Design a protein around this ligand. Sequence first.
Ligand code: DAD
Ligand code: CO
Ligand code: CO
Ligand code: NA
Length: 357
Amino acid sequence: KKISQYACQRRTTLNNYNQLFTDALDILAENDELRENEGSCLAFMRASSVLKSLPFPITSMKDTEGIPCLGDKVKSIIEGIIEDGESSEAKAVLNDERYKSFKLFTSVFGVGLKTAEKWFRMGFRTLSKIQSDKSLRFTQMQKAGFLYYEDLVSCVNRPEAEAVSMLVKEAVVTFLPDALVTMTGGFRRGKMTGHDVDFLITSPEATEDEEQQLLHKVTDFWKQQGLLLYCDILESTFEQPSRKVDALDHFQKCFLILKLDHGRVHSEKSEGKGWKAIRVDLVMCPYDRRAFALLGWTGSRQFERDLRRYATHERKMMLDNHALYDRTKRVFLEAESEEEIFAHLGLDYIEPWERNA
Ligand SMILES: Nc1ncnc2c1ncn2[C@H]1CC[C@@H](COP(=O)(O)OP(=O)(O)OP(=O)(O)O)O1
Ligand SMILES: [Co+2]
Ligand SMILES: [Co+2]
Ligand code: NA
């Protein structure tokens, strides 16, 4: 069949048949992303993404006939796989000192690219010789991502995620039995493990007052017990759906790190530190906007991008993290479910576990 160039019309399941290429592409892509080069990183992700779609491994350079997002540059990258087994380019970058370190520092919760670059140039090459250095002071968000570096870098599975879900509920519920918490992000896509536990919190009966207070009280609540390890409650700023470099307007969200006493987890498995620091996101959205919060905060990163990218370029509409807009009939189209939204963008629904680009 003749597929599409818009991930929004792609069925990207976690069942990948080209992990080989895809991986090697993700390296070069993560490369261009760090070597401050916002360009090629686009033809990489977009290519590596398409492949994740195919229902069969690519064998001969013959199969790549038809498939889009595949320019003469990337093929020579697949080339080095078919007739070799690994990508000389990729295989190269992994041992490239700029990369290694960068992906080594940013790996810290709190370490950005601007911060991970001033260090590289200072000469540091390991984070063992950084925290130690008695000179440069660390932002709280960094001291944090540092103090718990271990458990954090250790990823999380479902059983862990779930321990957090109740955790959140038994809490948020104590401030709104009306509350509706949906486990969102990667985990809701079907990843059996992710970096963090993304959540979306909402409720029908709730004033525009009770909203801007819950993300704090709940925070304070765990704080009251010890479970809170770090917090950064960004006040809801967002409310014309943006389309360029805007993370400037968002729902009320918060980045955290909880203390998940292992006793409170349900895994078929039998260590010091009965608990584990775990990264969690939290978002609140007035009930009349759950429909987009979910879609927006559900990913995939690349999926979202291509979604609204389609929205604009193909339907003359604007898809916000909050609300869509029809530039032709100049009206705010809305919906009570993701399902409806696609129907609006004129798209055959893509189940959440199908948005794994
Ligand atoms: N500034 C932003 N503006 C809009 N959406 C954002 C912004 N930051 C994050 N998001 C949304 C889009 C993707 C979703 C992403 O998160 P994350 O990167 O935590 O998801 P993941 O779930 O894919 O990775 P992991 O398994 O590590 O959580 O949250
Ligand atoms: Co996440
Ligand atoms: Co997140
Ligand atoms: Na980071």
